[PDB]
């Protein structure tokens, strides 16, 4: 699994430091093992349409 360039979030999503929002808070989070397994479940569900 490949993550995008972090600078994309830096210049657009956290452009100003004095303002806080939901996306800003979820920007600084690290997944655990169970969340990685959930992402794998997402992808397996996507690979079979019906």
């Amino acid at each position: 699994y490949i993550a995008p360039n972090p600078r994309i979030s830096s210049i657009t999503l956290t452009q100003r430091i004095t303002t806080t929002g939901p996306f800003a808070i979820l920007t600084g989070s690290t997944p655990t093992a169970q969340q990685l397994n959930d992402v794998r479940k997402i992808y397996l569900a996507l690979m079979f349409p019906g």
Binding site: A24, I25, T27, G28, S29, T30
Partner: peptide, 13 residues
């Protein structure tokens, strides 16, 4: 631990 926004989770126990 790099983002400041992760610290408030620790603050809230």
């Amino acid at each position: 631990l790099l983002s400041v926004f992760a610290l408030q989770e620790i603050m809230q126990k």
